Write a protein that binds this ligand. Structure first.
Ligand SMILES: [Mg+2]
Ligand SMILES: [Mg+2]
Ligand SMILES: [Mg+2]
Ligand SMILES: [Mg+2]
Ligand SMILES: [Mg+2]
Ligand SMILES: [Mg+2]
Ligand SMILES: [Mg+2]
Ligand SMILES: [Mg+2]
Ligand SMILES: [Mg+2]
Ligand SMILES: [Mg+2]
Ligand SMILES: [Mg+2]
Ligand SMILES: [Mg+2]
Ligand SMILES: [Mg+2]
Ligand SMILES: [Mg+2]
Ligand SMILES: [Mg+2]
Ligand SMILES: [Mg+2]
Ligand SMILES: [Mg+2]
Ligand SMILES: [Mg+2]
Ligand SMILES: [Mg+2]
Ligand SMILES: [Mg+2]
Ligand SMILES: [Mg+2]
Ligand SMILES: [Mg+2]
Ligand SMILES: [Mg+2]
Ligand SMILES: [Mg+2]
Ligand SMILES: [Mg+2]
Ligand SMILES: [Mg+2]
Lengths: 129, 141, 149
RNA sequence: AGAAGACGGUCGAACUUGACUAUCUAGAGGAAGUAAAAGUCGUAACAAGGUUUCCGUAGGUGAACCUGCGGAAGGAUCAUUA
RNA sequence: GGUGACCACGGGUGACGGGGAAUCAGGGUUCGAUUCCGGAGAGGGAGCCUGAGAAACGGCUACCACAUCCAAGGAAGGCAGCAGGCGCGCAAAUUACCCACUCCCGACCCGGGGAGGUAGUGACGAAAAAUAACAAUACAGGACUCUUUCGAGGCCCUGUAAUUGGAAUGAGUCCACUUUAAAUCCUUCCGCGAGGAUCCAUUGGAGGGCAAGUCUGGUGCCAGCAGCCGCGGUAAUUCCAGCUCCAAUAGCGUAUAUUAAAGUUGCUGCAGUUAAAAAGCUCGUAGUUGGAUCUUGGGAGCGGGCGUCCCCGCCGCCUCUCGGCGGGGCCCGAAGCAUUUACUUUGAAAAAAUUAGAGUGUUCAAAGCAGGCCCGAGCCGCCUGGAUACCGCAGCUAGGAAUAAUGGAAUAGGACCGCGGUUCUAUUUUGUUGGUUUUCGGAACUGAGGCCAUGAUUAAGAGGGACGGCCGGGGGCAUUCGUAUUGCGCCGCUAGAGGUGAAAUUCUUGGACCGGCGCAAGACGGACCAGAGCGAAAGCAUUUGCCAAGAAUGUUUUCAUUAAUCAAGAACGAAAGUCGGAGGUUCGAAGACGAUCAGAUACCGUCGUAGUUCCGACCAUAAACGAUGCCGACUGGCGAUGCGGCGGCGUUAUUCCCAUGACCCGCCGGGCAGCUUCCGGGAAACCAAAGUCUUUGGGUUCCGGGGGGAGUAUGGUUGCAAAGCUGAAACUUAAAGGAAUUGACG
């Protein structure tokens, strides 16, 4: 069933941007969704998303742009110990020149660059690039 | 698909464990059989006594007689055919003469022709065929 | 796609944004709790009350009119049933399957619909044991079941 | 003080007979496989393989085999012309 | 009583445990008997003395197991100390010299140490590194310059030769010295010590993988070659030889264990339409996995780029009931404690060697750890090192609270001198000690009040549960009918008919076959019947009744995380098959004959047993097949149809309309299906899904790792038995196979 609500959503916003779809809604919604999408907003990977408030769960509607090649999700949230952060961002991103492993540490949800500035580890969620 | 979860380190380990008794190359190595079966008791070469000289008929596409030796190994008393490599060297080896027999390179496969002959002769009465068939060291007497 | 059947259907109820009462309604939190009250008294299930109250009567949802949901209104006054209405509907059903199985020992079909039903019972039961509405002891028994309805 | 000694008890190698399990092997004679690869008797299969083929089960048969029943198409018909 | 599939218990090991090793894009994989740490045993056990300290083996006591001398009464035996030998063995050193170094025991500066060092053996292995260089010729060439080219000047070159030529050196040998303990070895050097014919480089190759000759001899499917592919049958690029070349090269070969290679064990990270492969189906305990939802925006400042936009310290809470740095504060000392963790970050602790890696003319390097210097040595001495990082998990400490669980108030409770009643008992206090009773301080208990905006998040395009009107060859149990079929009864007429690539056994004037009318028994439910229906899969169709059960839709019905998949364990499971029983309609293994055929113990015929038919037990398998696990998400079209709903625009009917109902036209959910396409997949065939996969991981179940041997043997278990389930190896084997292509033969 709905186990992981990212994988759910991120499939459907990778899986639109292939078709070139202009915008998409994501059915279940969550806090973690919002908080990881707002990360994608900063590096440009999407445009402004506007969350509907069906009284229950939430829907979102994501303005897409052309720019997202793929976003995916590492499904079990392994615990990343900062020394490993490299070994991951080697084998999970296309280059050292862009690509963003979104993860979730002590000091909020954020990309790997921002966990490195603050010097924290924590749990991998996914990656967009 | 695969089990993929996070407290699944065992279902995984124990999965990748048994699905090696379906590997062939480990069930030689880790089972028992091999050490029990190969006259060469896990041992690179072995010494044995030449009990007679036997020509073997090669596998159809290539007709020829191969010129091997029935050996009996010391350590086991297990018998053997070993193809005496290189031309006219069977001529050297006489009966009841102590030979150091090594493998063929296929470790169990019989090589090419020589149907069902894993072993090749190397030494003969502490000499080495390579020295004899070159004519460097003569036959001892 | 359902617990125990292939049919992967969806047909469900669906409420609006709005929750605030819809102004037809007179009654008030009291006169609804006066009425739930008299229906449960007469002998109806917490579902069945919610029913009578909407078709004939007026309340979209009790929950919105009063503070709490029907069961709590019965339970906090002590008109609530012995076991959950939701469960003895399965038990009553089981005992009905039992009966004709006991006359017709050929019905292979009835011998899921029993096994399934039994299993949808046990399954239910063992949260009602962790949510602690049932005491940690009660158990099905075929024999004692027919009585329990 | 005090040796040799003797009654008792305790750990207990050892020896004798059972039990188990492990491992390893002796064996009259019997039946497979493989080799392998050129003998005889057919010709089962692949072409509509001359009998669409195959599964399971059964029964039969010098041998492939054959025949029932239920299947399968991996067919030799994606159709049969209200 | 304790342990157990979070896999105990049992068995095995080519198992003394760590520290590391070689491998290695990241992750592992195997090895670690190996000098450092930890353990054990001295043929095996047991017991012993003695000892602080031992159950001590360079003690002894037996026994067992071994074995020596003998005067035959007796006696002495323990190398898994060092040397050595034997046996085993594919597989491993000298009866060497010594306390000089490091250390230890002693009563001890003084002896001893096979601990240890030093030699010898020593392609276990690692480092460095000769096996020649150079001038001039003779030439053999080729970039400037010169020449139309041929030629030449020549700064450039390089090939072979003459060695023309001397120069240089080491390998050796050996005066001498150092070394050391005495040597040896090394480092130092006198003296001798290079023209190849020497001071002499070999091992495999020379078709390809794979760098290197269809050079030349010989053999001629032999010998032989060839890890695989292969060559060899009279010119072999393949054998044996010759010459030439290539690779590495002082090393180099084959023996096999093992790692990459292996995206062929796949955590990262394989696969399951057909290639090896998804249980027949379903339930289901462990396990794994599980929606959303709860402090924030914002404030105050310092600092980058009147305000706006990045960048920092702040607004862990509570306590102060607790310390104190006659009444104090001030806040640290204590604890509510981080709900209870999981997580993350910082410490501390992590034996050295190894490792990573600071520093360093070991002549470099493996190494070594020193060295450097100051110094003309008058300095009678200075200066610096012996860096650091990692060190899993668990354990310890401290920050953070991103996510994951987990917790707290609901048949009432937190606090609020809120108040009392009951009891308790501590101790200050009555100039001291006892008694009684108090006040008070702290428990415990408990009457009765005040306040607390006093407590339930929502209902999942999750689930569970109620109700509604349909729906459906879903299941059972009754009941009813239909034909044909054979059987018989009767009657009519008459001689052939059935069967067939043709015929006969067969049935028949004892009148068969045919015709008619009657009964019979059992079968099976024709057309209607469909990419139509239902169930789980086996699955499921004459009428009617009854009996439960179910999907779907409908639903501002209720419950509220209850769920998915699931080892283990259950329910059902064509046919065939088996025990019971009932029945014998046809068909029909087996079985009998006729033909056909070279034969047919086959097909094609004619009989007909078990069984197909029923009721009762078992069995538990299919090509049980969509050769597609189940749940969950997403991505395009377009047509149709089953059900339910909804809406509309029709009308036939049907009535005055209606309600309907029957058609039409839409929409909506979930069903069975179709086509179409450069989504995107896909080896290919193909596939709305086999799509979302090097852009690798939504959850989870099963399961394959070349083919056979083999679904065999053996073991276990179930079964009355067929058999079912679990399920090896030796051996052999190079492809077997799959998808598509041309062929070519049906
Ligand atoms: Mg289920
Ligand atoms: Mg096949
Ligand atoms: Mg052993
Ligand atoms: Mg010994
Ligand atoms: Mg000891
Ligand atoms: Mg002892
Ligand atoms: Mg000794
Ligand atoms: Mg050796
Ligand atoms: Mg020594
Ligand atoms: Mg070396
Ligand atoms: Mg030399
Ligand atoms: Mg080659
Ligand atoms: Mg490997
Ligand atoms: Mg790799
Ligand atoms: Mg594979
Ligand atoms: Mg299936
Ligand atoms: Mg009919
Ligand atoms: Mg099972
Ligand atoms: Mg059956
Ligand atoms: Mg039957
Ligand atoms: Mg019977
Ligand atoms: Mg017949
Ligand atoms: Mg099967
Ligand atoms: Mg697939
Ligand atoms: Mg993958
Ligand atoms: Mg295999």
């Amino acid at each position: 069933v709905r186990m992981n609500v990212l994988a759910d959503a991120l499939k459907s916003i990778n899986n639109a941007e292939k078709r070139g779809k202009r915008q998409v809604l994501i059915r279940p919604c969550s806090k973690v969704i919002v908080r990881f999408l707002t990360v994608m907003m900063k590096h440009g990977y999407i445009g402004e998303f506007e969350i509907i408030d069906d009284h229950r769960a939430g829907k979102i509607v994501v303005n897409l742009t052309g720019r997202l090649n793929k976003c995916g999700v590492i499904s079990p949230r392994f615990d990343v110990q900062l020394k490993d952060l490299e070994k991951w961002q080697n084998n999970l991103l296309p280059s050292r020149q862009f690509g963003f492993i979104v993860l979730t540490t002590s000091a909020g949800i954020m990309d790997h660059e921002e966990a490195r500035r603050k010097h924290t580890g924590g749990k991998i969620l996914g990656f967009f690039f | 698909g695969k089990c993929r979860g996070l407290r699944t380190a065992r279902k995984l380990r124990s999965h990748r464990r048994d699905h090696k008794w379906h590997d062939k190359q480990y069930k030689k190595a880790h089972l028992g059989t091999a050490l029990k079966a190969n006259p060469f008791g896990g041992a690179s070469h072995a010494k044995g006594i030449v009990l007679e000289k036997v020509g073997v008929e090669a596998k159809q596409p290539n007709s020829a007689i191969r010129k091997c030796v029935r050996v009996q190994l010391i350590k086991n008393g297990k018998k053997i055919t070993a193809f005496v490599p290189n031309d006219g060297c069977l001529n050297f080896i006489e009966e009841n003469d102590e030979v150091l027999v090594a493998g063929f390179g296929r470790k169990g496969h019989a090589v090419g022709d020589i149907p069902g002959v894993r072993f090749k002769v190397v030494k003969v009465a502490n000499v080495s065929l390579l020295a004899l068939y070159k004519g460097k060291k003569e036959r001892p007497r | 796609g359902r617990m125990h059947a292939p049919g992967k259907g969806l047909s469900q109820s669906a409420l609006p944004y709005r929750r605030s009462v819809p102004t037809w309604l007179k009654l008030t939190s009291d006169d609804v709790k006066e009425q739930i009250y008299k229906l449960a008294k007469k002998g109806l299930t917490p579902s069945q009350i919610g029913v009578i109250l909407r078709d004939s009567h007026g309340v979209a949802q009790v929950r919105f009119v009063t503070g709490n949901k029907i069961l709590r209104i019965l339970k906090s006054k002590g008109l609530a049933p012995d076991l959950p209405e939701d469960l003895y509907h399965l038990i009553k059903k089981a005992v009905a399957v039992r009966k004709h199985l006991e006359r017709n020992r050929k019905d292979k079909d009835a011998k899921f619909r029993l096994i399934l039903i039994e299993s949808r019972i046990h399954r239910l039961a063992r949260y009602y044991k962790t949510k602690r509405v049932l005491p940690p002891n009660w158990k099905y028994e075929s024999s004692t079941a027919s009585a329990l309805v």
